[PDB]
């Protein structure tokens, strides 16, 4: 499988991936997910363990304890789906150490947002 659709300037990670599975191909995102789960399992077990099946908990800030493994999984996902390097990693909502007065924050390209917003 080789998706030809490419990310926009301000397109979300979920948006782009749903637009990858919008190509017919796979019937639903789950079918694609389980097929990549299989290929990660055959490649790297740690990245397989990190990569979730659902679209719910796929953004980097959801993973408190396996962020490094999530990035790995995402990088292997790029490598495996015939995409250029960093292609998924620029759409990711990354982690941020800055506190908004005891409020954990979230990082988009240049900008850090309070998680309440």
Partner 1 sequence: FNTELDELSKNAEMKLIDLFNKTEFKFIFGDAILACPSTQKQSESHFIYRALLDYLVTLVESNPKTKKPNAADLLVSVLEAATLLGTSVEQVYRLYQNGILQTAFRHKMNQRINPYKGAFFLRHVIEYKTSFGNDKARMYL
Partner 2 sequence: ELCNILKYDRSLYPGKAVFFYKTADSDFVPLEADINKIRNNILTLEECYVPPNVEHIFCRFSLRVQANSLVPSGCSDPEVFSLLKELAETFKECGGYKELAVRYCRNILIGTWLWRNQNTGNTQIEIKTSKGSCYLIDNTRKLAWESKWASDDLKVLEELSNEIESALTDPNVFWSADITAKIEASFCQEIYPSQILNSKQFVKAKCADGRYAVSFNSVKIGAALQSIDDWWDEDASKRLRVHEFGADKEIGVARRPPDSEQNFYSIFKNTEWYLSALKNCITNNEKIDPAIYYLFSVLIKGGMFQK
Where does this chain bind partner 2 (CB under 8 A)? 30, 33-34, 37-38, 41, 49, 52-54, 56-57, 62-66
Interface mask toward partner 1 for 5-44; x: CB under 8 A: ---------------------------------------x
92 binds, among partner 1, partner 2, none (CB under 5 to 8 A by kind): partner 1
Which of the ranges 16-24, 25-33, 34-42, 87-95 carries the binding residues for partner 1, by CB under 8 A? 87-95
Count of H-run helices and E-run strands, the chain: 4, 3
Q: Is 24 exposed, middle or buried (0-12, 13-18, 19+ CB in 10 A)?
A: exposed
Length of the chain: 117
Phi, psi angle pair for 21, to nearest 5°: -80, -15
Query: Cβ 97 to partner 2, closest distance in Å?
Result: 18
Instruction: Measure CA 76 to chain center.
Output: 11
């Amino acid at each position: 499988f080789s998706p030809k659709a490419r990310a926009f300037s301000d397109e979300s990670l979920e948006s782009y991936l749903l637009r990858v599975v919008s190509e017919n191909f796979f019937d639903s995102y789950e079918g694609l997910s389980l097929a990549i789960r299989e290929e990660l399992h055959e490649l790297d077990f740690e990245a397989h363990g990190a990569f979730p099946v659902d679209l719910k908990r796929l953004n980097v800030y959801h993973a408190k304890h396996n962020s490094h493994f999530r990035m790995r999984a995402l990088g292997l996902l790029e490598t495996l789906l015939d995409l250029p390097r960093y292609e998924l990693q620029k759409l990711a909502l990354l982690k941020s150490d800055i506190k908004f007065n005891s409020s954990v924050a979230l990082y988009n390209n240049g900008v850090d947002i309070p998680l309440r917003f």
